[PDB]
Amino acid sequence: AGIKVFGHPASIATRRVLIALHEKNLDFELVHVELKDGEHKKEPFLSRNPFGQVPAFEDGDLKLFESRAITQYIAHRYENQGTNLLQTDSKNISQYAIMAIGMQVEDHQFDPVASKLAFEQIFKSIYGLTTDEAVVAEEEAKLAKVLDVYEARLKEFKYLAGETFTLTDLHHIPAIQYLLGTPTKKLFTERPRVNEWVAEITKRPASEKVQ
Amino acid sequence: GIKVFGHPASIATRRVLIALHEKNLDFELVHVELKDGEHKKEPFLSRNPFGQVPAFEDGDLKLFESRAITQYIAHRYENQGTNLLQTDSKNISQYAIMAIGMQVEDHQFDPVASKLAFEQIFKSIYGLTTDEAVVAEEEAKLAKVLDVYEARLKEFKYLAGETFTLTDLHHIPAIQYLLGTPTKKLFTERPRVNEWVAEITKRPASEKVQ
Amino acid sequence: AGIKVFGHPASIATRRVLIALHEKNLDFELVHVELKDGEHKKEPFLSRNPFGQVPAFEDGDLKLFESRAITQYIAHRYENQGTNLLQTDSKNISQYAIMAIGMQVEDHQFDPVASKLAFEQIFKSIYGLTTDEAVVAEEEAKLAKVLDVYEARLKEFKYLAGETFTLTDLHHIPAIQYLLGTPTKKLFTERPRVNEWVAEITKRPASEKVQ
Amino acid sequence: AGIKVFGHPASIATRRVLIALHEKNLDFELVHVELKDGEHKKEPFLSRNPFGQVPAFEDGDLKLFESRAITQYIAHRYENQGTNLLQTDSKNISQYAIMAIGMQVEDHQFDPVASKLAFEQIFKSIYGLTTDEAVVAEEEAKLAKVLDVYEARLKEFKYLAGETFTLTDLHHIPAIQYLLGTPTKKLFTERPRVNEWVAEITKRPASEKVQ
Amino acid sequence: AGIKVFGHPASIATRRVLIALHEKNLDFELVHVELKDGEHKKEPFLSRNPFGQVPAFEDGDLKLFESRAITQYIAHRYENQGTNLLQTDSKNISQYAIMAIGMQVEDHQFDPVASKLAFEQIFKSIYGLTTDEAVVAEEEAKLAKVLDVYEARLKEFKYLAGETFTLTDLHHIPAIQYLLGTPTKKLFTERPRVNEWVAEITKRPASEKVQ
Amino acid sequence: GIKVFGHPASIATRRVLIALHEKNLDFELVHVELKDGEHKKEPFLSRNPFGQVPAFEDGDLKLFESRAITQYIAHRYENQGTNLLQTDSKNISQYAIMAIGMQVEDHQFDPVASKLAFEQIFKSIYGLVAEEEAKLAKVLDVYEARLKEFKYLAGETFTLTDLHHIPAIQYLLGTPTKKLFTERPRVNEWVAEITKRPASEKVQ
Ligand SMILES: C[C@@H]1O[C@@H](Oc2c(-c3ccc(O)c(O)c3)oc3cc(O)cc(O)c3c2=O)[C@H](O)[C@H](O)[C@H]1O
Ligand SMILES: C[C@@H]1O[C@@H](Oc2c(-c3ccc(O)c(O)c3)oc3cc(O)cc(O)c3c2=O)[C@H](O)[C@H](O)[C@H]1O
Ligand SMILES: C[C@@H]1O[C@@H](Oc2c(-c3ccc(O)c(O)c3)oc3cc(O)cc(O)c3c2=O)[C@H](O)[C@H](O)[C@H]1O
Ligand SMILES: C[C@@H]1O[C@@H](Oc2c(-c3ccc(O)c(O)c3)oc3cc(O)cc(O)c3c2=O)[C@H](O)[C@H](O)[C@H]1O
Ligand SMILES: C[C@@H]1O[C@@H](Oc2c(-c3ccc(O)c(O)c3)oc3cc(O)cc(O)c3c2=O)[C@H](O)[C@H](O)[C@H]1O
Ligand SMILES: C[C@@H]1O[C@@H](Oc2c(-c3ccc(O)c(O)c3)oc3cc(O)cc(O)c3c2=O)[C@H](O)[C@H](O)[C@H]1O
Ligand SMILES: C[C@@H]1O[C@@H](Oc2c(-c3ccc(O)c(O)c3)oc3cc(O)cc(O)c3c2=O)[C@H](O)[C@H](O)[C@H]1O
């Protein structure tokens, strides 16, 4: 009954879902999955996601996993409450496609790089493992290319899909929150439109709630 | 009209081509010469700054990312040819189920399938020897994905439900390649997966790009 | 305190030092080196270890690094307090050599394998990453060969250097603590003298203090 | 009947043969072998080359494989037509040996390095993959040494075997064509005699026919 | 000043040259290059071969390197003395091409595998290293394929290029001599026509002179 | 008496041999035929169950692990030949400083030096690096800084810390990796001194 998120409050992909829920002012329960104990690779969590990755999700009888499938469900199902996470005219197909390009680009070009950066520089550090400086340099060079594209794009429009905040922007927030606490920060601050964009999306109340 | 900027052997290009054929749409395939690095040069970079085929045009609308393109095609031309969305396309929960499968193809299937094709086909063109360790590690991963698919296909005829959708369509080009390799066994040894592969690969739109 | 340890409490090599200090009932400060902030790759930590790795160590004016150099120093400098970590007759050179063989074997044969097993099964799994089952199988086969040697050895003597607990046994403890929380546990439990040895050394109060 | 080449028009080794045929103004059929479908590792291609490598070749009843055995056959069999691919005085044994050194050097020192560089910088990109910048730097250093030797050699003579274009030069052309579309280009252009040599051999009509 | 070979008497490539010289009954000096002291990577040897590999070679004013360029030069320059190392009718271009296929095959398919097998099983011991049994198994499987092709070939003809002993056969001898002192021997003796071929070419006086 | 069970080319065997020569000790080198897998068979396995050269004997005492052996030699025969311990061997802090260097040689230097030697000697000789040279440079920069303060790695005298590096260095001096040593002036002098020692030249 109601909306439940099965995840961990430090997980990037879990935070994606949490931010979208807060943006919609939805009530929900966060059910804690203990990653340190391998609970995500055990039953019963495996029956909610056989790939053993947080988050999983429930809205009544509907059971989901994959953060970006979940956010998009939220954005459609609860379109008319709270922040609109779709384009202003959500019935405009070409505008939806432009948002979709940006979502694909986050998923394929931004996230794997940002993830590796956060893993090397933050998560390894929590367990006393040493950061591989070569992976960091290689991954920062990649991220700089992605951010150069974003810079050009943000010269044209206030946000990545157009003039309003959407899922394209939202999906970047958790990884960015973590990378702002690392030397990777410079890559965002040295690009002026990227920097303003980061400042706006991270100061949103929904973003600050999960931080 | 509709133009696709890509290469006819490319997995991601074939994704778009199959969707266009399924909609019976006319279009032009404008060849991008990957062997000459044309995808990492202007003017192709001005269509996709990440230098990856395919890019796409429908009148004034310019796109890239194969799965954004296919979805656009499926919505813009919803009412002609094959329906690539769910039967009731206005049902939001049903759309979310399709979306899970599309995410799963992208994150769990495609990177593994793409490594298996690289090691067993593409390395052989060129001078290179297939790393049998990568092949074994990747086949074990693929088996886990296909076990999930098997369970799912016991419940429903296709991956998103009772009808062929983008979730199935996105898998076709990688599968077409892997059927020419010993990885074939992973599909054939799983009966519902095997039937599913036979159905989706024998579709006329699939055969047109082969 | 006189004695300071510069490390991280989850680090295997740091725990080696901590256990030795506790065994000697020494007072000391653990100074937590902030790996996430790159503190280990900055002055003043680099003046304690130019290779930028944890732990480093101080006893008055004496500055050290390398966990096994530190534990040995502790064992000699504070020989006649708390547990004896050297051989019963510490002046016996041949007996010291037998302990030294075991310490070398821990360093070369045991530690790199145990480390990789912990990384693949614990560190990676907690994050998003999939445990490479091939590395696990290859490494477990190596570990089994080591533990077979240990089994034969523990049929002759209560501990690895002879009849008493020494640094040879102590140096294995932290890695073992981690591997007991993984399926690699079986390799220890399926060997009866190894199993009794693991049970004894991990139930020591000094071992439990760092867990 | 007549000359047939069994290969693929993008293949470096196939192009070697094609260029030699064009230089002799020979008529021939290119029979396409579908490498993407593994046709080279199946019968009937395996009966033409049991090592499953393109190209294979036929001139009437004579069946050959190995690109450099084929080019040499072409150069002798059809010596007196089109471009002379042997030395001016082809009966001069010491001059032949000098050409033979160069051909060996292309095969052993140039080709494996040039191949790797093309793979890392062009072919990996076609598939997902990322170019390993370390391999590129290691291989470019190797290529630079080769090209330094070539530079010295080209200060004495117009081409690599002497004053005329021969098989020694011809065998380099296909790999060079690919590397001119990569940043490795600089290694050629930064060496003035190498640069002029590359410009000459790539602007030959036979070279341009296969491009 | 006559024929000089600059190399080392244990080197496979040097032995190639020595055998050809002995087959021609030529007088020559072997000038020792001390590999263990890096003499091959220093002047004056580098001025004979800028790639720093034995052997180099001299016949009067003519300076050469690459063992197979040298053997071929010897076979042409001294064609009409001692053993003919070319085909019976050396003016027959198709017959030359058939010998050339076999020479290419020895270089590309046989030599790299045979050379690894000799390194793992014989020469690793010279430097105090242990034989990698996995490399050995992988390489023996490759060598078996090559030898199966050779077996088929030798059903048709007494030697690899036809009815008479040529450079194709000669180039295999040194590697084979070494592999006959290893368990790899079985691959040759398992195959009856290969076995008779090995027995014939290794019992030649010129072969025995370098052993 | 003293016996060493190993192979004369083996880096770890040479470590032991050098220490014996430095102490002017008589001993027998009993060859273990690695090419024939003798190290992975009985009776060698009963001297070292891990099947690695060298093993060692001094009367009834049986040892393996080169660095355990060198240290035993340095203590058992402390007062003869070269002192391989610190000048004041009873000084515990000074021993610890030598111990840091021995650990550093084992963990930071040896694995890198060993890879470089085995890739290049052989690439150069039998026709079969950049990542490893970068790692080695870092280690050698630390050594350079250290050798500005003291004549040797543990202090003012030659000790086991220096000795343990010798065999790998001997091999690397026959490769282009030589430059990493020569481009660092204090490292270069240190290498020249430790490799010209008679005990080092005896095993070369
Ligand atoms: C609000 C909806 O937005 C758009 O539908 C699309 C949707 C979509 C519709 C309903 C859902 O429950 C859902 O999760 C996604 O998805 C798209 C994804 C793409 O990658 C590209 C598209 O053009 C659409 C696409 O056009 C359309 O404008 C549609 O007419 C409208 O009902
Ligand atoms: C102006 C467009 O920018 C670039 O494409 C991107 C688009 C986009 C493409 C086509 C459109 O019609 C549109 O309005 C936006 O959107 C992006 C969104 C992101 O979040 C990130 C991106 O890199 C792009 C991104 O790279 C391409 O150069 C495109 O062909 C060009 O038309
Ligand atoms: C029947 C469902 O199977 C699994 O979810 C999947 C679904 C799915 C299906 C129907 C549902 O009502 C639903 O909530 C989820 O669909 C998939 C599609 C794919 O292409 C691949 C998948 O891995 C799943 C996939 O793993 C999950 O274990 C889910 O919790 C369970 O209810
Ligand atoms: C009885 C002895 O066992 C084995 O050596 C080991 C020794 C050792 C050698 C000589 C002795 O007198 C002694 O009491 C112990 O100690 C070990 C300690 C470990 O932690 C691990 C080991 O593998 C050995 C280890 O393998 C060897 O087979 C040795 O040569 C033999 O004499
Ligand atoms: C000038 C020559 O350079 C080197 O030999 C080569 C020769 C060559 C040897 C003897 C001659 O009389 C001659 O005119 C050229 O030719 C080459 C050609 C290539 O295409 C590549 C090479 O590396 C050499 C190559 O390395 C040798 O160091 C030789 O000592 C010297 O005479
Ligand atoms: C019987 C022949 O075998 C194969 O070619 C080889 C030839 C060869 C080709 C055409 C001829 O007319 C001829 O007399 C010999 O010779 C070889 C010699 C070697 O030392 C190694 C080889 O693999 C072949 C080798 O593979 C090819 O399959 C060829 O097409 C076929 O005609
Ligand atoms: C000669 C001895 O040296 C020093 O003992 C130490 C020894 C040691 C003593 C006797 C032996 O047979 C042996 O093989 C090693 O080892 C150490 C190792 C370290 O890593 C750190 C140390 O401080 C000592 C440490 O201080 C001490 O100065 C001891 O007082 C003295 O008897």
Side-chain angles (χ1 to χ4, degrees), chain A residues 1-3 5-28 30-35 37-40 43-62 64-90 92-132 134-144 146-154 157 159-185 187-202 204-211, chain B residues 1-34 36-61 63-89 91-127 129-131 133-136 138-153 156-184 186-201 203-207 209-210, chain C residues 1-3 5-35 37-40 43-62 64-90 92-132 134-144 146-155 157 159-162 164-184 187-192 194-195 197-202 204-208 210-211, chain D residues 1-33 35 38-41 43-60 62-90 92-94 96-115 117-123 125-130 132 134-139 141 143-144 146-150 152-154 157 159-162 164-184 186-192 194-195 197-199 201-202 204-208 210-211, chain E residues 1-3 5-35 38-41 43-60 62 64-76 78-79 81-90 92-115 117-124 126-132 134-144 146-154 157 159-162 164-184 187-192 194-195 197-202 204-208 210-211, chain F residues 1-32 34-35 37-39 42-61 63-89 91-114 116-122 124-127 129-130 132-137 139-147 150 152-177 180-188 190-195 197-201 203-204:
Chain A
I3 298 163
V5 179
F6 302 86
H8 187 288
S11 142
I12 283 167
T14 303
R15 290 183 178 190
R16 247 183 291 263
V17 173
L18 298 179
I19 294 165
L21 292 167
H22 291 314
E23 286 285 345
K24 293 282 174 199
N25 315 131
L26 290 159
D27 296 325
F28 64 90
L30 175 55
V31 177
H32 198 265
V33 180
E34 197 66 72
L35 290 189
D37 295 354
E39 201 187 315
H40 66 297
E43 292 290 352
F45 185 77
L46 287 176
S47 301
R48 299 186 169 282
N49 178 2
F51 301 102
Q53 291 299 340
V54 295
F57 175 95
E58 215 171 73
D59 181 2
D61 302 333
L62 181 63
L64 305 174
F65 61 94
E66 287 281 13
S67 63
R68 305 168 181 79
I70 299 158
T71 56
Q72 147 188 72
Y73 166 81
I74 290 160
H76 279 85
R77 179 65 178 77
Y78 301 101
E79 184 175 2
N80 294 290
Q81 344 194 9
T83 307
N84 187 25
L85 299 174
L86 303 178
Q87 215 76 97
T88 304
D89 182 4
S90 67
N92 184 322
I93 293 165
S94 68
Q95 289 281 306
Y96 205 108
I98 289 157
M99 196 182 64
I101 292 168
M103 293 187 296
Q104 288 299 292
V105 166
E106 184 276 327
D107 190 343
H108 294 151
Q109 304 292 351
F110 188 90
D111 195 46
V113 178
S115 196
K116 264 162 171 179
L117 286 162
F119 180 73
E120 293 295 334
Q121 293 174 298
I122 305 165
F123 305 134
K124 272 182 152 184
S125 295
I126 290 167
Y127 291 80
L129 305 169
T130 70
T131 99
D132 188 334
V135 175
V136 172
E138 177 165 21
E139 292 305 301
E140 285 191 348
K142 287 175 196 166
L143 186 55
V146 178
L147 296 176
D148 291 340
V149 172
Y150 285 14
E151 189 62 22
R153 187 64 194 148
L154 292 164
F157 296 91
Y159 293 99
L160 291 178
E163 279 302 292
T164 63
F165 175 85
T166 66
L167 292 177
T168 300
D169 313 284
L170 185 146
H171 289 173
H172 294 91
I173 296 168
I176 288 172
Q177 291 170 326
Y178 276 117
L179 294 175
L180 292 175
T182 72
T184 308
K185 183 177 215 261
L187 282 209
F188 299 99
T189 59
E190 75 185 346
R191 298 171 166 73
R193 281 291 293 110
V194 167
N195 188 66
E196 232 163 84
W197 173 76
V198 166
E200 285 301 302
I201 70 181
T202 55
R204 293 195 144 242
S207 304
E208 291 183 328
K209 280 187 180 109
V210 309
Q211 218 170 17
Chain B
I2 297 163
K3 299 177 168 55
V4 178
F5 302 87
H7 186 285
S10 142
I11 283 167
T13 302
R14 288 184 177 189
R15 249 183 245 108
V16 175
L17 298 178
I18 294 166
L20 292 167
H21 291 313
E22 285 286 343
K23 294 282 176 198
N24 312 125
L25 289 160
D26 295 324
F27 64 92
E28 179 180 17
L29 176 55
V30 177
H31 279 229
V32 180
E33 199 65 70
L34 281 358
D36 296 353
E38 211 157 81
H39 66 297
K40 302 290 180 190
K41 298 185 232 171
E42 291 291 351
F44 186 77
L45 286 177
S46 84
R47 301 184 170 282
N48 179 359
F50 301 100
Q52 289 180 325
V53 297
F56 175 95
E57 214 172 72
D58 181 2
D60 304 333
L61 182 64
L63 306 174
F64 60 96
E65 287 282 10
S66 62
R67 305 168 182 79
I69 296 158
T70 56
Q71 277 182 266
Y72 166 81
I73 289 161
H75 279 90
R76 182 64 182 71
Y77 300 101
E78 179 177 1
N79 297 295
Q80 74 195 71
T82 306
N83 187 26
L84 300 174
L85 305 178
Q86 215 76 97
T87 303
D88 184 5
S89 69
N91 184 323
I92 294 165
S93 314
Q94 289 286 139
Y95 206 107
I97 290 156
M98 194 182 63
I100 291 168
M102 292 186 298
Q103 290 297 298
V104 168
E105 183 276 327
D106 191 343
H107 300 322
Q108 303 292 346
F109 187 90
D110 192 48
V112 177
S114 290
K115 263 161 174 178
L116 284 163
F118 179 74
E119 291 294 335
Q120 293 175 299
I121 306 164
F122 306 136
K123 269 183 152 183
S124 184
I125 133 164
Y126 293 135
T129 69
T130 97
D131 188 332
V134 174
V135 170
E138 293 304 299
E139 283 191 349
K141 287 174 194 166
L142 188 54
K144 281 188 261 257
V145 178
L146 296 177
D147 290 337
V148 172
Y149 286 14
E150 188 64 20
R152 193 91 227 99
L153 294 163
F156 297 92
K157 208 188 168 60
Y158 293 96
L159 292 178
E162 278 302 290
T163 199
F164 174 84
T165 67
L166 291 176
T167 299
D168 313 282
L169 185 146
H170 292 171
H171 292 91
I172 295 168
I175 288 171
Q176 289 170 325
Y177 280 112
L178 294 175
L179 289 176
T181 72
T183 306
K184 183 177 216 266
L186 278 78
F187 299 100
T188 59
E189 291 186 339
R190 297 170 167 72
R192 280 291 292 109
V193 165
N194 189 66
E195 227 337 73
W196 171 76
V197 166
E199 283 301 299
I200 70 181
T201 55
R203 293 195 144 245
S206 305
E207 290 184 326
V209 310
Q210 217 172 16
Chain C
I3 299 162
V5 178
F6 301 90
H8 185 289
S11 140
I12 282 166
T14 302
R15 287 183 179 191
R16 249 184 290 262
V17 174
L18 297 178
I19 293 166
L21 291 167
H22 291 315
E23 286 285 344
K24 292 281 175 200
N25 313 127
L26 288 159
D27 183 37
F28 64 92
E29 327 180 18
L30 177 54
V31 17
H32 296 260
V33 174
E34 198 65 71
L35 290 188
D37 294 355
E39 200 187 315
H40 65 298
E43 292 290 354
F45 186 83
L46 286 177
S47 301
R48 306 164 177 305
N49 180 0
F51 298 99
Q53 289 181 323
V54 136
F57 174 94
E58 213 173 70
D59 181 4
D61 300 334
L62 181 63
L64 305 175
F65 62 98
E66 286 282 9
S67 64
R68 306 170 181 84
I70 296 157
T71 54
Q72 278 181 268
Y73 166 82
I74 289 160
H76 279 88
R77 180 66 177 78
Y78 301 101
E79 181 176 359
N80 77 194
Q81 346 205 85
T83 308
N84 186 26
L85 302 174
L86 305 178
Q87 215 75 96
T88 305
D89 184 4
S90 68
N92 181 323
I93 294 164
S94 68
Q95 289 281 308
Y96 206 108
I98 288 156
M99 195 183 63
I101 291 169
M103 293 186 296
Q104 292 298 295
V105 166
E106 186 275 329
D107 191 344
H108 296 148
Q109 302 288 353
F110 187 92
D111 193 48
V113 177
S115 198
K116 262 161 173 179
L117 285 163
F119 178 74
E120 291 295 333
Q121 293 175 298
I122 304 164
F123 306 137
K124 274 183 152 184
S125 186
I126 287 167
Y127 199 64
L129 310 170
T130 69
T131 96
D132 186 334
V135 173
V136 172
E138 177 166 21
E139 293 304 304
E140 283 191 349
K142 287 174 196 166
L143 188 54
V146 179
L147 294 176
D148 291 339
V149 172
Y150 286 14
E151 189 63 22
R153 186 63 196 149
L154 292 163
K155 282 154 195 294
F157 296 91
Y159 294 97
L160 292 177
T164 62
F165 176 86
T166 66
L167 292 177
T168 300
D169 313 286
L170 186 146
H171 289 174
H172 294 90
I173 295 169
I176 287 171
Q177 289 172 321
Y178 278 113
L179 294 175
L180 289 176
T182 72
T184 306
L187 280 209
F188 298 100
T189 59
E190 76 186 347
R191 297 171 167 72
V194 167
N195 188 65
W197 173 75
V198 166
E200 285 301 303
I201 71 180
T202 55
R204 292 195 145 242
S207 305
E208 292 183 327
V210 310
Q211 218 170 19
Chain D
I3 298 163
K4 298 177 170 53
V5 178
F6 302 86
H8 178 108
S11 142
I12 283 167
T14 302
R15 288 182 178 191
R16 249 184 289 264
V17 174
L18 299 177
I19 293 165
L21 292 167
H22 291 314
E23 286 285 345
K24 294 282 176 198
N25 312 126
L26 288 159
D27 203 314
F28 63 94
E29 179 178 4
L30 176 53
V31 177
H32 287 54
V33 179
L35 289 189
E39 200 187 314
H40 66 296
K41 301 289 180 191
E43 293 290 354
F45 185 80
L46 287 177
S47 301
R48 300 184 170 282
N49 178 2
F51 302 102
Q53 289 181 134
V54 132
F57 174 94
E58 214 173 72
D59 181 1
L62 181 63
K63 304 186 203 323
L64 306 174
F65 60 95
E66 287 282 12
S67 62
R68 304 169 182 81
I70 297 158
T71 55
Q72 276 183 267
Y73 166 82
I74 289 160
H76 281 88
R77 181 65 178 77
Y78 299 102
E79 182 175 2
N80 295 293
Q81 345 194 8
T83 308
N84 184 29
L85 300 174
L86 304 178
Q87 216 76 94
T88 305
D89 183 4
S90 68
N92 182 328
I93 293 165
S94 68
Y96 205 108
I98 289 157
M99 196 182 64
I101 292 169
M103 291 186 297
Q104 290 298 296
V105 165
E106 184 276 326
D107 191 345
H108 296 150
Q109 304 291 350
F110 187 91
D111 194 48
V113 176
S115 199
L117 284 162
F119 178 73
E120 289 294 334
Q121 294 174 299
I122 305 164
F123 307 138
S125 184
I126 286 168
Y127 305 97
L129 302 202
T130 70
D132 186 334
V135 174
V136 169
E138 178 148 279
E139 293 304 299
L143 188 54
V146 178
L147 295 178
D148 290 339
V149 172
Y150 287 14
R153 294 280 39 258
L154 294 163
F157 296 92
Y159 294 97
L160 292 179
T164 62
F165 175 84
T166 66
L167 292 176
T168 298
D169 313 282
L170 186 146
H171 292 172
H172 295 91
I173 294 167
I176 288 173
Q177 291 171 321
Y178 277 110
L179 294 174
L180 289 176
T182 72
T184 307
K186 69 171 203 271
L187 282 208
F188 298 100
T189 58
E190 78 187 347
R191 298 170 166 74
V194 166
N195 188 65
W197 173 76
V198 166
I201 70 180
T202 56
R204 293 196 144 243
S207 304
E208 292 183 328
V210 309
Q211 218 170 17
Chain E
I3 298 163
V5 177
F6 301 88
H8 186 289
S11 140
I12 282 167
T14 300
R15 288 184 178 192
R16 248 183 244 107
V17 173
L18 298 179
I19 294 166
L21 291 168
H22 290 313
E23 286 284 347
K24 294 281 175 198
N25 313 129
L26 286 159
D27 296 325
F28 64 91
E29 180 179 16
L30 177 54
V31 179
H32 174 83
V33 182
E34 200 34 86
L35 283 357
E39 199 194 332
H40 65 296
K41 301 289 180 191
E43 291 290 354
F45 184 81
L46 287 177
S47 83
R48 300 187 231 262
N49 178 3
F51 301 99
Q53 288 180 325
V54 296
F57 174 94
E58 214 173 72
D59 182 0
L62 182 63
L64 306 173
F65 60 95
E66 288 281 12
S67 63
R68 306 168 181 81
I70 298 158
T71 58
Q72 277 182 264
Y73 164 80
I74 290 160
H76 279 87
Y78 301 102
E79 182 175 1
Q81 124 200 11
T83 306
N84 185 29
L85 301 173
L86 305 178
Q87 215 76 96
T88 304
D89 185 5
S90 68
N92 182 325
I93 294 164
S94 315
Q95 289 281 307
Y96 206 109
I98 289 157
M99 194 183 64
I101 292 169
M103 291 187 297
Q104 290 298 293
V105 168
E106 183 276 327
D107 192 347
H108 300 322
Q109 304 293 344
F110 187 90
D111 194 45
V113 177
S115 291
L117 283 162
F119 180 74
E120 291 294 334
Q121 293 174 296
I122 305 163
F123 307 138
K124 262 183 150 183
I126 286 167
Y127 306 97
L129 307 170
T130 69
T131 100
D132 189 331
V135 174
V136 170
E138 175 166 21
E139 294 304 300
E140 283 191 349
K142 287 175 195 166
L143 187 54
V146 177
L147 295 177
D148 291 338
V149 173
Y150 286 14
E151 189 63 21
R153 248 313 266 175
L154 293 163
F157 296 91
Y159 294 97
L160 291 178
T164 198
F165 176 87
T166 66
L167 292 176
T168 300
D169 311 285
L170 186 146
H171 289 174
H172 296 88
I173 296 168
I176 288 171
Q177 290 171 323
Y178 277 117
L179 296 176
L180 290 175
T182 72
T184 307
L187 279 78
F188 298 101
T189 60
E190 273 178 343
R191 298 171 166 73
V194 166
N195 187 69
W197 173 75
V198 166
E200 283 301 303
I201 71 180
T202 55
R204 293 195 144 242
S207 305
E208 292 185 325
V210 309
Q211 219 173 18
Chain F
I2 298 163
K3 300 178 167 54
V4 178
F5 302 87
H7 185 287
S10 140
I11 281 167
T13 304
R14 289 185 177 187
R15 249 184 244 104
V16 173
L17 297 179
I18 293 165
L20 292 168
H21 290 312
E22 285 285 345
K23 293 282 176 197
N24 202 47
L25 288 159
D26 297 324
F27 64 91
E28 179 178 19
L29 174 55
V30 176
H31 279 230
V32 180
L34 282 357
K35 91 187 180 155
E38 201 193 333
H39 66 297
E42 290 289 354
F44 184 81
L45 286 177
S46 84
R47 301 184 171 284
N48 177 1
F50 299 99
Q52 289 181 322
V53 299
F56 174 95
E57 214 172 72
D58 183 358
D60 301 331
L61 183 63
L63 306 174
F64 61 95
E65 287 282 10
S66 62
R67 305 169 180 80
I69 297 158
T70 55
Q71 149 183 268
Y72 165 81
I73 291 160
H75 280 88
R76 180 52 71 107
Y77 300 100
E78 181 178 359
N79 294 286
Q80 122 199 6
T82 307
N83 186 27
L84 301 175
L85 305 178
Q86 216 74 99
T87 305
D88 185 3
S89 68
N91 182 322
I92 294 165
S93 314
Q94 289 287 140
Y95 205 110
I97 287 157
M98 194 183 64
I100 292 168
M102 293 186 296
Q103 291 299 296
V104 167
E105 183 276 328
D106 192 345
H107 300 321
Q108 304 289 354
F109 188 90
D110 193 48
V112 177
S114 290
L116 282 163
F118 303 147
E119 291 297 330
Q120 285 177 298
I121 288 165
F122 309 137
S124 182
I125 300 169
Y126 306 97
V129 172
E132 293 305 299
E133 283 191 348
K135 286 175 196 166
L136 189 53
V139 178
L140 296 177
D141 291 338
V142 173
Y143 287 13
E144 188 64 20
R146 187 63 195 148
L147 294 163
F150 297 91
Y152 293 97
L153 292 178
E156 279 302 294
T157 62
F158 176 84
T159 66
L160 291 177
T161 299
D162 313 283
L163 184 146
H164 291 173
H165 294 89
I166 295 169
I169 289 172
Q170 290 169 329
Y171 278 114
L172 295 175
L173 289 176
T175 73
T177 306
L180 277 78
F181 297 103
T182 57
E183 76 186 348
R184 297 171 166 73
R186 281 292 292 108
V187 166
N188 187 63
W190 173 75
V191 166
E193 282 300 303
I194 71 180
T195 55
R197 291 196 145 244
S200 305
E201 291 184 327
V203 309
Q204 219 171 17

